[PDB]
């Protein structure tokens, strides 16, 4: 009953099971630990970062090793459009003979790989199960390096100080230039040297790379300035990927669009992209001042940025010390940027597939988009939660105020009511009218008169599609016109490739849109606005409100303030995160439902099914869920089973976890404490069991813990059931 | 970089004078015990108790390897594979083309014998109050003192004799595995070569 929460003496003195539960959930909140200083905080965070990167590299190495050992990578190379990639083998003693037979792939039961790693590794120039093994070996070596570094930087003479950790200019210069630019430069080097010849049949391994010229002229044009030579003779339109037939000699080109065979971006396009990004980031990494008297001091930049007329208060004067001294502000900024970035990855890796033969891998396309959108929602909610935490525990009004006037951040708490009221107005506006139009379509179609539907053509979005060259909406605007200056300017660089790809019905590049797209985009906007409303309200109201003008004194996460003053359930800022998680899950569900139904109709060919039935709710319920759930639920029946049996089991498992979350959310404490007391009496008053007694007094889960557990069940069930549905439906419908 | 100190003066390494002399074995033992208590206090890790137990097991296993070689040579060690219909799909190793290669029955029998011996060990582990030599160290008990580079030359059924023979057997197993890995033959093939041919005859 002691010594487990070593970091908290208050918990270690708890005589109940709450100590164990809270010991888990407070282990990473280093700022709240006993005998805590800032130096130890930054050093522990640094070591934890090292361990985390080691974990990531070990996970990647495991994926590589299992593809190399139990996969069919080599067979998939020779026939990427017919051979289904294998993730890893299965050894489960609970299998019957039927399950073994159904999951049997080649030599052993195995799982199909939906991560798209086969296409990614094939694109970057891997052709052998020994290339994957080398990658796994190297990644385990890197993990060992990172673990050694993490141990080393906790040693006495190697523990960095607060000044080093808060040295913003040095870290920015190095991160930008070194990390981004130099990693892009090295990736361009690999892309060219290995990937470009490997796509043309020439093997460039760790033996013949110092003697195989990536370009026939060989670094002469680069120093000579004849950089056009690297773009001459690109890959033809009859080039077979991985073979020298119809190949070229160029390494950096503009082509635009996709490879005619793999239906993916040109490797020479991506090498040029990464070279340009490398140059730009290396240049941008010299901005801030270091030991050589030139550069920028960001404190001065922030302080000097006050509009002269005066509408942002005193400007950004106090922001430098605010961000530097708070790890939650930086964490929130990083999480918001990462969420936007992974939303970008999801939205671009389906419209512009970058890996060979990934466009025809429909289950992996759906899985990748869903995975990245869910990660995006999680990251955004985390960014807002950490902003709220910064408000609660790191924000100092004195730093952000100069002689009564407030800086740009402190002024966000002055018109907080205006911000929240207008977020509420936008949410109500969008919800009222999107639901009104959807229900109008529902009722009108149900009454057998679909012509009375309200169908709004998304002209604004179709205008953008025409601006990028789509000649489908008869707009003749910028790139849909051959005479506009936008078209004449790039008529010789990348329009022929771009136009040939955007004006193609088999791509996902700028999918044609209609009224259903309009309505679902408005639903998405409503979801985004409502999630933002909850999170922003929790962040701004974190330090106090009218119901609790001292909420900052109770911390970020506390159960309530009691039944007084009318009742104060879910009044903390943590509860705002807890409520906004449901809205994030709902919004990501809407986004992924829209994406998956649109792409299922596109792949099956019945795009008229979406364009007609997507305007009313029953259309969704009947033609997406009810229609495509048939292959999934018949993964095992009283007659047999298929390789989709695991997905049906996961479907039911997700439903069960969802409803257990419903348990933990609807039923609150107090009802579970008295029942536990009855159980305690029963155990204490029964023979043959009195010999065994608990060391920690069994008590009901706390209010905040119960909310967390219900949210965890809700989210896990949500994710599992939707993953099972999307994967099984795609597999069982599209062969 | 220049206007500040990367490492504070208050956080600097101090040379541990407590390990002066203290040959690498004593230094390693002290470092392990200080760094990992509650597993060192149990006798686990680089400890004389663990060394003695592992030596006993290595000697018994040299005996077991000789017995296994004899059984393989003398027509024992049942033939074929396990019945998947009888023992489920967990005994299936691979399916090449329409035939299920299962775990060899000889491997199953050897695993059952090893299970017998390991069960005996587990009973002795959860029988601490009735066994002559316990597996772990009692709280308070102190680990027997390391024997050193060369244990005392005391012939017979002595602690030093068992210690020396356990070290020799463990080194022999290490050498056997190293020879098998370097040259590439089976473990029993290496033992057969190292016995002239008198085992697999």
């Amino acid at each position: 009953v002691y010594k487990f929460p070593k970091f908290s003496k208050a918990l270690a003195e708890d005589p109940s099971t709450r100590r164990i539960w809270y010991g888990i959930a407070t282990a990473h909140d280093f700022e709240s630990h006993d005998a805590m200083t800032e130096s130890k905080l930054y050093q522990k965070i640094f070591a934890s970062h090292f361990g985390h990167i080691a974990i990531i590299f070990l996970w990647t190495a495991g994926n590589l090793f299992h593809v190399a050992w139990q996969g069919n990578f080599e067979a998939w190379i020779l026939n990427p459009l017919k051979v289904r990639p294998i993730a890893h083998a299965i050894w489960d003693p609970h299998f019957g003979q039927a399950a073994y037979k159904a999951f049997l792939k080649t030599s052993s039961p195995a799982n199909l790989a939906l991560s798209g790693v086969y296409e990614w590794w094939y694109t970057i120039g891997m052709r052998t199960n020994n290339d994957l093994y080398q990658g796994s070996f190297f990644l385990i070596l890197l993990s060992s390096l990172l673990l050694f570094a993490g141990w080393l930087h906790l040693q006495p003479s190697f523990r960095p100080s607060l000044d080093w950790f808060k040295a913003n200019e040095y870290r920015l210069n190095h991160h930008l230039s070194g990390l981004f630019g130099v990693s892009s430069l090295a990736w361009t080097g690999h892309l060219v040297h290995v990937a470009i010849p490997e796509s043309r049949g020439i093997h460039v391994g760790w033996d013949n790379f110092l003697t195989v010229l990536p370009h026939p002229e060989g670094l002469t044009p680069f120093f000579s300035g004849n950089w056009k030579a690297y773009a001459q003779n690109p890959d033809t339109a009859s080039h077979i990927f991985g073979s020298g037939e119809g190949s070229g000699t160029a390494i950096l080109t503009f082509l635009g669009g996709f490879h005619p065979q793999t239906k993916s971006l040109w490797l020479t396009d991506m090498a040029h992209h990464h070279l340009a990004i490398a140059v730009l980031f290396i240049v941008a990494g010299h901005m801030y001042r270091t030991n050589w008297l030139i550069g920028h001091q960001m404190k001065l930049i922030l302080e000097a940025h006050r509009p002269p007329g005066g509408r942002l208060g005193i400007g950004h004067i106090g922001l430098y010390e605010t961000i530097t001294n708070s790890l939650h502000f930086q964490l929130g900024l990083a999480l918001a940027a990462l969420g936007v970035a992974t939303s970008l990855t999801a939205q671009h890796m389906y419209a512009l597939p970058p890996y060979a033969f990934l466009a025809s891998n429909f289950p992996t396309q759906a899985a990748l988009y869903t995975h990245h959108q869910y990660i995006a929602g999680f990251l955004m909610v985390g960014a807002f939660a950490h902003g709220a935490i910064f408000f609660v525990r790191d924000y100092d009004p004195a730093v952000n105020t100069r002689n009564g006037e407030k800086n740009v951040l402190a002024r966000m708490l002055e018109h907080k009511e205006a911000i929240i009221s207008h977020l509420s107005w936008v949410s109500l506006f969008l919800g009222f009218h999107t639901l009104g139009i959807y229900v109008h379509n529902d009722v009108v179609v149900a009454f057998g008169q679909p012509e009375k539907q309200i169908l709004v053509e998304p002209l604004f979005a179709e205008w953008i599609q025409a601006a990028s060259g789509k000649t489908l909406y008869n707009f003749d605007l910028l790139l849909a016109s051959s005479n506009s200056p936008a078209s004449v300017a790039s008529s010789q660089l990348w329009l022929p490739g771009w136009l040939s790809a955007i004006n193609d019905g088999k791509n996902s590049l700028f999918l044609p849109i209609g009224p259903g797209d309009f309505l679902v985009h408005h639903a998405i906007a409503l979801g985004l606005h409502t999630t933002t409303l909850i999170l922003v309200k929790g962040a701004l109201d974190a330090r106090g409100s009218k119901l609790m003008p001292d909420k900052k004194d109770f911390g970020y996460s506390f159960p309530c303030d009691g039944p007084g003053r009318g009742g104060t359930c879910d009044i903390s800022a943590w509860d705002a995160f807890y409520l906004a998680m449901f809205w994030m899950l709902n919004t990501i569900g809407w986004v992924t439902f829209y994406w998956h139904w649109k792409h299922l109709t596109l792949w099956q060919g019945n795009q008229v099914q979406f364009n007609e039935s997507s305007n009313y709710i029953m259309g969704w319920l009947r033609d997406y869920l009810w229609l495509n759930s048939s292959p999934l639920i018949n993964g095992y029946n009283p007659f047999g089973m298929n390789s989709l049996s695991v997905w049906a089991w996961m479907f039911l498992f997700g439903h069960l976890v969802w409803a257990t979350g419903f348990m933990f959310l609807i039923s609150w404490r107090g009802y579970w404490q008295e029942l536990i007391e009855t159980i305690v009496w029963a155990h204490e008053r029964t023979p043959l069991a009195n010999l065994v007694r608990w060391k920690d007094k069994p008590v009901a889960l706390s209010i905040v813990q119960a909310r967390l557990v219900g949210l965890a069940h809700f989210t896990i069930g949500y994710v599992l059931t939707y993953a099972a549905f999307v994967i099984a439906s795609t597999i069982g419908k599209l062969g | 970089g220049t206007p500040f100190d990367t490492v504070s003066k208050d956080e600097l390494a101090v040379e541990n004078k407590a390990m002066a002399g203290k040959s690498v074995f004593e230094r390693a033992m002290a470092d392990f015990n200080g760094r990992y208590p509650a597993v060192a206090a149990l006798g686990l890790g680089p400890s004389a108790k663990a060394e003695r137990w592992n030596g006993r097991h290595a000697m018994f296993g040299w005996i077991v390897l000789l017995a296994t070689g004899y059984a393989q040579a003398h027509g024992l060690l049942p033939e074929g594979g396990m019945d998947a219909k009888e023992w489920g799909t967990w005994v299936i190793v691979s399916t090449t083309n329409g035939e299920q290669v299962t775990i060899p029955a000889a491997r199953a029998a050897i695993a059952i014998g090893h299970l017998h011996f390991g069960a005996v060990g587990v009973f002795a582990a959860y029988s601490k109050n009735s066994v002559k030599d316990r597996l772990l160290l009692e709280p308070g008990e102190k680990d027997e003192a390391p024997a050193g580079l060369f244990p005392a030359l005391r012939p017979g059924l002595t602690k030093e004799a068992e210690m020396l023979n356990g070290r020799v057997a463990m080194l022999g197993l290490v050498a056997l595995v190293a020879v098998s890995a370097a040259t590439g033959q089976d473990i029993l093939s290496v033992i057969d070569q190292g016995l002239g041919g008198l085992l697999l005859k």
């Binding site: 070591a47 934890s48 361990g51 080691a54 093994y133 993990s143 060992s144 141990w151 | -």
Partner: peptide, 30 residues
Amino acid sequence: MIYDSQVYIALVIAVVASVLAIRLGATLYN
């Protein structure tokens, strides 16, 4: 198909990465 030697040494290297992980884990304290 990878050999027994390839998998074995990868397992051995994985063990070394494990001992480095507990050293980091124990250094981040109990």
